[PDB]
């Protein structure tokens, strides 16, 4: 349903923006693992969380 998809996408962005503010919750080591393909570390974490 469109409502469920819209709700999931908005919540995913709210979580991602929160966990990357101030000192990130996620360490620099795994950001390196997820960036190795060239994508942004923030985008890679969003994909992995989904």
């Amino acid at each position: 349903t469109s409502g469920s998809i819209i709700n999931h996408a908005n919540n995913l962005n709210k979580v991602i923006n929160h966990v990357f503010a101030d000192k990130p919750l996620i360490s620099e080591t795994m950001l390196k693992i997820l960036t190795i393909d060239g994508t942004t570390g923030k985008d890679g974490y969003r994909n992995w969380l989904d």
């Binding site: 349903t1 469109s2 998809i5």
Partner: protein
């Protein structure tokens, strides 16, 4: 491209023959994939909804 043939040679070939030719060479992408349908609702507000 894959079986090293020209367009005129395979001109009078059915979908079954083309699929068989490609699978023998080792190409598995010979199928069409149906798309799932997402139900969408527009809230009424000041007009009947859709």
């Amino acid at each position: 491209f894959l079986t090293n043939t020209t367009y005129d040679i395979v001109n009078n070939d059915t979908i079954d023959v083309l699929k068989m030719k490609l699978r023998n060479q080792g190409w598995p992408f010979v199928e069409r994939y149906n798309a799932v349908e997402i139900d969408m609702s527009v809230e009424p507000l000041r007009s009947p909804g859709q």
